[PDB]
């Protein structure tokens, strides 16, 4: 069996370092890579770093000077150099899937309460169908990425799923209902026949190995009109 899991999570001061760690279970740290993800309560999910397998670093623009990713050969960790108020977030460690900077494997997440370049357009932000209807999610990119988009699911208080990695390739276990469409700058998930069970926020994301091209979109949050 296949897992990961972030521990580390705690109540800390403004400008306290921390280190969060992630332990894998069933394959290893050698042959994978592992990356960062953060979503601040209720909001969206931000795009942190990655170590490789041979244990080389990138850091979204962002995110340079404000953490540090180490690894062992068990653990990978994640040092948040000066916390701030605005790091206050769950923090997802996640295995790399494919060929770009998507991921297949997440944990359930870490919390960290902190208490004393590409741009992703997703619209719309909310949006119900009825039973069986057909709901339409667009994500602008504002450089072309080619084909380096990833689609993924989170419904409420859980960690995110992939749907979907290279635009339009479905990801193990994922219903045909969903389809993923474009090229370049513009790009849709289309999720037909809605289901009360597809009811959860959906998340583009800019692929691209290349530290000012990886990004979430904002997300969508579909509803199922009763
Ligand atoms: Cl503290
Ligand atoms: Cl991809
Ligand atoms: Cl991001």
């Known amino acids: 069996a296949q897992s990961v899991e972030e521990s580390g999570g705690r109540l800390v001061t403004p400008g306290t370092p921390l280190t969060l760690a992630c332990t894998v279970s069933?394959?290893?740290?050698?042959?994978?890579?592992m990356f960062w993800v953060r979503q601040a309560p209720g909001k969206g999910l931000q795009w942190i770093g990655i170590?490789?397998?041979?244990?080389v670093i990138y850091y979204a623009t962002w995110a340079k000077g404000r953490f540090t990713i180490s690894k062992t050969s068990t653990t990978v960790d994640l040092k948040i150099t000066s916390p701030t108020t605005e790091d206050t977030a769950t923090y997802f460690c996640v295995r790399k899937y494919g060929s770009e900077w998507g991921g297949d494997l997440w944990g359930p997440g870490t919390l960290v309460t902190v208490s004393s370049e590409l741009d992703m357009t997703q619209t719309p932000a909310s949006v119900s169908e009825p039973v069986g209807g057909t709901v339409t999610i667009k994500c602008q990119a504002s450089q072309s990425i080619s084909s380096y988009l990833a689609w993924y699911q989170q419904k409420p208080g859980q960690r995110p799923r992939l749907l979907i990695y290279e635009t339009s390739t479905l990801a193990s276990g994922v219903p045909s209902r969903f389809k993923g469409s474009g090229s370049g700058t513009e790009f849709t998930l289309t999720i037909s026949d809605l289901e009360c069970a597809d009811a959860a926020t959906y998340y583009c994301q800019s692929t691209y190995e290349n530290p000012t091209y990886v990004s979430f979109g904002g997300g969508t949050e579909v509803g199922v009109k009763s």
């Open positions: 170590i490789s397998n041979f244990g």
């Open positions: 069933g394959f290893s740290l050698n042959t994978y890579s």
